[PDB]
Amino acid sequence: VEVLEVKTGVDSITEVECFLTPEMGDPDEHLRGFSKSISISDTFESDSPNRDMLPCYSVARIPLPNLNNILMWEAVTLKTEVIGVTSLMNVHSNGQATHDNGAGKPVQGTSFHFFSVGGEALELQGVLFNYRTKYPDGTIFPKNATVQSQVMNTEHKAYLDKNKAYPVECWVPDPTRNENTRYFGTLTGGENVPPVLHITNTATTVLLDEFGVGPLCKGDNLYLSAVDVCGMFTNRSGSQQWRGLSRYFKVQLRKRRVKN
Amino acid sequence: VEVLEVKTGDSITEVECFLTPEMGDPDEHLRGFSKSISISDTFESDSPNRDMLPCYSVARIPLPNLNENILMWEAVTLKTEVIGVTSLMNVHSNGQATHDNGAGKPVQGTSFHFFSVGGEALELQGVLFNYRTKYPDGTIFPKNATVQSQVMNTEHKAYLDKNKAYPVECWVPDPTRNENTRYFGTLTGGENVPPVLHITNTATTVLLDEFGVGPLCKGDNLYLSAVDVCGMFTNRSGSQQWRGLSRYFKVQLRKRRVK
Amino acid sequence: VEVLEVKTGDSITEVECFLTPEMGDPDEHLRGFSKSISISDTFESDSPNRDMLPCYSVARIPLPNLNEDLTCGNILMWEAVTLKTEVIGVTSLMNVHSNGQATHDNGAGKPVQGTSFHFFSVGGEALELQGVLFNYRTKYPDGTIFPKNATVQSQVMNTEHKAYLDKNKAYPVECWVPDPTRNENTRYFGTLTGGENVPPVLHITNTATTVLLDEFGVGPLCKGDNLYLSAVDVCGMFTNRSGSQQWRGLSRYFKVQLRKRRVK
Amino acid sequence: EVLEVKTGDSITEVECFLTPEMGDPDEHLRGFSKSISISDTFESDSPNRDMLPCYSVARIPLPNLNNILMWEAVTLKTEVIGVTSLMNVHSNGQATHDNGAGKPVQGTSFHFFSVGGEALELQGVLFNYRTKYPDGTIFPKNATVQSQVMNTEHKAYLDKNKAYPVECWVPDPTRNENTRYFGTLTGGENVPPVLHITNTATTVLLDEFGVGPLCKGDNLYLSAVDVCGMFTNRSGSQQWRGLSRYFKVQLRKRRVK
Amino acid sequence: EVLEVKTGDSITEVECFLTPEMGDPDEHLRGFSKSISISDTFESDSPNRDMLPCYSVARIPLPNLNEDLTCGNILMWEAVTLKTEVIGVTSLMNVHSNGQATHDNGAGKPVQGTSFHFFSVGGEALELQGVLFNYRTKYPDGTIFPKNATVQSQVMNTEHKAYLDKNKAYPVECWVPDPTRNENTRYFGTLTGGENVPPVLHITNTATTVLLDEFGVGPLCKGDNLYLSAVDVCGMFTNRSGSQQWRGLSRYFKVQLRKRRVK
């Protein structure tokens, strides 16, 4: 692709605004946004997580206005934030008291907050904590796993092309690809780490690369991806479940002429 | 709305006030505190009492009347901080000794520090931890909740239009709206989180957007909103109460011509 | 007053001061410490002893005398432009051998830790205070200056509680904060870090300067050729072998550069 | 003498990944060390080879160039590959409390990377100068008690994989003129990993004179350590866990004399 | 009065390391203190010398200036930049010897707890002010400590002025840089308190600190001597018994200097 001029004038810009719901496992009709309680295998050989115990990547493919030496929509800016951060102040709903007569233990512990904006599906590389883990039917996971899959097995390449299917723990953005995506993520690990969730409508991320070029939307499609595992909820029994929240996206795009 | 020139010269005004916290105020001695926390045994039986629920604070401030092609007040800058941070050093008032012969456990745990400045009420989106929570009479809460309310139900839209009414835990700023408000908040979660509270009279936040335009005050009203849940106080017994503090606002406004 | 030009040439001066902490000093051996903390039996009966309450520190520093001759429509005032500051004696908190509480069997003593308040201000007049009470039913002791006529509203904001930091070892830290509605002629800075296990994090350097000018380029203007310096440096608590806990404070160094400013 | 940058055929890119070398104690445990044991005394400290993480290195031949031209490394993009794998708290872990999830990877971490025009230069520093390092490792020789603080005899090059233990070597700050290195040790028994990923961050490798590493013999050297913390199994036993590191380096031709 | 920089042997570099001085309680324990004992009463605090970490200092001779008689002006070496880091950070990964398990079957507790990381570069000795945790502490023979201590020594006794002019002598816990002096030194330090604080140690050869003041002048080396000072108490090592020893690491310094004419 030779990238040529940006179009200007009123008709040259469009906006996408939406939210992506979290896909934490949803183990019953009352527990949207939560995983199944987390149960521990007695060996690496016997690790066999149920589908409703595994958070997955969220993805949306957003059609843009049809454009067609062609024009492509170029993603320029992102505003994003996590929706519902104050819901984590519910310390009165079958939580585990943190001491005798105390309030319930807030959601805390391992978190993964991730978002991406691209002109095509996010490209994934598989990495397994334990290559002998048996992933469940209904999920898309690294196949033909070997012990090398615990560090780097280049066979595990996939596209984030289905919602509620790609387990978070199996897949990361492939840093060897993703030229046409901008991605951002943070894993904070530990059973007691505190969520720190900032909200504001005053913050913008610029999506242009060092050449001044943003993601270019192939086929006039914008891909948005997210994970917002906020931590674990500990109930009165001591059982723990992942808890996720939705993510808001607002993306500004402009028409860009290319030669491909 | 077409935004035209800033007036110069009579063209400026300042709003200064404090917003008191609304933590629940369970009796005549406990302004700034909630009721002590109790925990349901199931999600279906979660039924928090009104005095156990911190709520958003709001003040709707009349500005000097304009226009008897009009002028509007434009909010340009904010100074803000939390008032009374040192009160949290009281570790001697019938708290829970941290060990034998020790001082009382200080206020700590989950905090939410939030403020907004707008030219109209803050727009809210409801999100529920547990959609089966029964919110109490005298609060304004997400109605017709479903399990999807635990992640995003677009029916739950409201305005922060009443003080001591909108519980913190079931509402956030709506990021799909609020074009005419600037909002900022941080939730820090965990029972052992230490309050970290900074004070200074030297820090200013600019409220202009990327086009150089601040909130424009509809009807010559400025809306200030806040939450400052600092953490929980632990009583000798182990029972825990939310503790909040007031927030200072100083807003500088200027007259802007609009069509 | 209208602020006019800065004088150049005899036109600058420097104040260098240390302010000692006022933690309560319960006996002739315990400068820098409070009395050990005692907890009231009921919330209503909170009644801290004076020597248990850290107080704000203040010094008023006389500057070189200005306006010795009759002047017409204008005077000079010293304008505070820059500050260097840090906490003096941070390494003393490495004494983990002086009859503290072992962290575990055979271990070293638990270091000073827990709730801290580090605060400083520079002004051309006393720091203006607003009272806020944790518990409006607390009985504050003789020898302290505390919010009077307390009501339940005092727990969040009672505008009756206005004071000046105009006496050392008198205004309890827990009762008073800088009044954000006043202090036009002071620059203040503070951080409360709350929690019994909070670690002190104390930085020292002679390479860091804070500029005291406001957005109009004007620093504090020293009324009567006096500079007001205020501080609190509650570093945390020391835990004795018995488990009893005392606040521990440290001194604060101040270096302020001032220039002569003409005012109308 | 460093002269002008060539412009125009003047650039090349290296992209690769370095796998971690944590000890690999059996055919199922690539990326992990042996379980960590505690010798009774410094005198008895004799760590098993499989318990010792090592530095990773790759030597990458570049396009042949030859007053000569050298490849100059200008920019780096890097990140840790597989950070989400640490979400597996359901595999032979130790419950944090009754009915809880497994304790996640936590505790001491070392995240380190370097880009140079020659092998990374190492200085040995020993926690305990009496440690017996095992056959198959390359370690500080003729150790003395001064090796616990600084013994200038302990100089080496990071010139072999599965060989140089992390705990006894650091980048030599007295050398490495032709390398850029970056590392963070985060200690503590319970510290939580904090791992950021993004394809939007670039590190510039030029020094204060505008000169990057110059690749001797048209070879680029990449080195890494990514000990993420320890995995606690159901018994309470702990193993180091490491992850691979991605590198993308942009290079340009530079004339030198 | 500082005049122009001389250009053209107008620059020199100092590169060295300073070893830590933690107490070295026996022939095997260089870099460690004696294990910490606690006094039976506050008044009876009496630390042994080998329990007390001390400040490190080196005085480095520079190329001799002013060999010929000069009239009203001399040259001085001016320190302009510093590169520094802690040497041996990975040694703290030895959790496999002589330690106390973190939990049943776990690895040894790592070095953690109170740290002090400090460095200075000056054209003369670092100037110190004494502050005592406890004025009734008996400091041991072989150390240089605040003398004629009074209760005011617990907060600020201006008697307690010293120069960091001897290695293995000035206890860390007794002394800090004197902010009322040190015009001709640049100093930097951080105390991180608490028994469980985790070390966070960064290394890189890409970071430079500029030593120039707000007038563009660095430390000026009196008598062509450069003073480097350091403390790097990284935390405490815990033995199986529970006893705890301070552990320190060496510090690397690289300083660039230029010749500056002065009146």
Ligand SMILES: CC(=O)N[C@H]1[C@H]([C@H](O)[C@H](O)CO)O[C@@](O[C@H]2[C@@H](O)[C@@H](CO)O[C@@H](O[C@H]3[C@H](O)[C@@H](O)[C@H](O)O[C@@H]3CO)[C@@H]2O)(C(=O)O)C[C@@H]1O
């Ligand atoms: C900050 C504060 O007020 N702490 C109190 C709390 C709170 O007021 C309460 O948790 C807020 O919801 O209450 C503590 O318990 C007292 C509370 O239960 C009251 C209610 O009337 O009763 C007190 O005990 C009475 C007892 O009920 C009588 O039978 C007896 O004659 O007198 C007792 C003493 O008045 C409880 O102490 C609490 O720990 O939650 C006390 C805190 O200090």
Ligand SMILES: [Cl-]
């Ligand atoms: Cl479940």
Ligand SMILES: [Cl-]
């Ligand atoms: Cl009780």
Ligand SMILES: [Cl-]
């Ligand atoms: Cl093993």
Ligand code: NA
């Ligand atoms: Na709540």
Ligand code: NA
């Ligand atoms: Na695959």
Ligand code: NA
């Ligand atoms: Na107090």
Ligand code: NA
């Ligand atoms: Na609703």
Ligand code: NA
């Ligand atoms: Na000491």
Ligand code: NA
């Ligand atoms: Na009063």
Ligand code: NA
């Ligand atoms: Na998982």
Ligand code: NA
């Ligand atoms: Na050697």
Ligand code: NA
């Ligand atoms: Na090791």
Ligand code: NA
């Ligand atoms: Na002395």
